[PDB]
Amino acid sequence: DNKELKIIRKDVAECLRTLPKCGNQPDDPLARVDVWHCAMAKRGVYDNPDPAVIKERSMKMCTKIITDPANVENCKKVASRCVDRETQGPKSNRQKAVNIIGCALRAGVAETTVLARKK
Amino acid sequence: DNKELKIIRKDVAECLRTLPKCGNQPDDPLARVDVWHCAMAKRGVYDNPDPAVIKERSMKMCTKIITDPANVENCKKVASRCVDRETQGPKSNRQKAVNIIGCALRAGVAETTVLAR
Ligand SMILES: CCCCCCC
Ligand SMILES: CCCCCCC
């Protein structure tokens, strides 16, 4: 929705600012795992560590930051897959969240978002 | 090929080791821009900053780390687009290289590689 994209953009900009500058990072914030995770964290996607809930909320987010229905479904399919894989094991909840984001970024979901197709 | 892939895997592992541990990074090295850039740098892809040369070498790399012909072509199309866009402007050559990698990662190319899978 046009209300939530305004909000997410403001959150990306703020994450860009507060996140530590570290070596070898792309200038494009939407190419950065730490920015996406930071942004999604603020939208509450990871406020509850239950994998089923993270999955619900991620799929909801796909609808939203993407308009094309085909790409919306691809995002949902990928969110499900990434949550299933990356919430297994003994890593911390915060690191699992970061890994989920990395999995989605690697899969190409970021490219299909309105944030990327309106820079 | 299998020989090139053996070499790249060894380069990824070594980049994983030598690269600074920075906050909020995925455990998956193939999800990391700094690892990919580090790996591709070692294969000489950015050994000459001429955009035309970076493009030729990137497209060549697509054929080595991807087997599906359809995905090979997509990688090539994306490499071309990223080099064209991210080598413009006054940023340093090294940073332009990193930005190229970030552009390809964002586009999904990493997912289609044999290393990933
Ligand atoms: C999969 C739900 C949003 C992911 C953000 C793309 C990096
Ligand atoms: C410059 C080489 C393109 C392949 C990078 C994959 C992320």
Swiss-Prot record, chain B:
Cellular component terms per the entry's GO annotation: extracellular region
Lineage top rank: taxon: Eukaryota
Keywords, alphabetical: Allergen, Disulfide bond, Secreted, Signal
Subcellular compartments: Secreted
Disulfide-bonded cysteines: 15-38, 62-75, 82-103
Tissues where the protein occurs: Expressed by the venom gland.
Complexes and interactors: Homodimer; disulfide-linked.
Family: Belongs to the ant venom allergen 2/4 family.
Protein's recorded name: Venom allergen 2
Organism, scientific name: Solenopsis invicta
High-level lineage: Eukaryota, Metazoa, Ecdysozoa, Arthropoda, Hexapoda
Full-length numbering of the shown residues: 20 to 136 of 138
